[PDB]
Each structure stands twice: as C-alpha cells, then as structure tokens.
C-alpha cells in the first residue's frame, strides 16, 4: 500500500476475467502483449518468485484451485526500456 501516490505504467497487463477471479477449477489467461512492443520480453512472477515456465505473451492457467490462488505480474524488459512490472493480479476463487 501507500499514503496515496499516483503513477502510470506503460505495460497494460490483461487478465481473464478482468476482475481477476474464477471458480475452483476454471481457466485464466494472462495476456501481457505490449501495444508498443510486438514481441517484448514477457515474464511471469508469483509472490515475488520466478515460476518454472517459458516466457510468452500468453500464459493460461487451466484447472485453477485453492493452491493456484495468489498474485501474478508481468515484467517487460527490452531495449530503450527498464524493469517495468505491470500491476499485480491477485487470482482468487469466487463463491457463486
């Protein structure tokens, strides 16, 4: 958190659903395809730790559950750019 600072970010992480939640056993899609960059350096972190998976502009997490719950985030790193971490998406289970 923070007292109340306002900032911007080039990267626009897109999760599905947008809300960032799904039933216990669904499938989510983490799209971080930067508009300015065609094939930038896409990354995936879970709780401040690099997950064992190949870097791609599309990361689907089928069969989500309680263990899946957490907070993901895509980081873009390429020429004329720096370590920019997109908003953190907290994936949780919905109780319909």
Here the CATH number for the domain that contains residue 15 is 2.60.40.10
Rounded Cα gap, residues 66 and 82, in angstroms: 33
Domain that holds residue 73: 3-96
Q: Give the residues across from 22 on adjacent strands.
A: 93
Q: Give the residues across from 28 on adjacent strands.
A: 61
Question: CA separation (Å) from 83 to 24, 36, 77?
Answer: 33, 16, 5
Q: Give the residues across from 84 on adjacent strands.
A: 76
How many domains is the chain partitioned into structurally? 1
């Amino acid at each position: 958190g923070s007292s109340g600072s306002s900032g911007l970010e080039e990267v626009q992480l897109v999760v599905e659903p947008e809300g960032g939640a799904v039933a216990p056993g669904g499938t989510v899609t983490l799209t971080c395809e930067v508009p300015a960059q065609p094939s930038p350096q896409i990354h995936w972190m879970k709780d401040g730790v690099p997950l064992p998976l190949p870097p791609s502009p599309v990361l689907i997490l089928p069969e989500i559950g309680p263990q899946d719950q957490g907070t993901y985030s895509c980081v873009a790193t390429h020429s004329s750019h720096g370590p920019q971490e997109s908003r953190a998406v907290s994936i949780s289970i919905i109780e319909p």
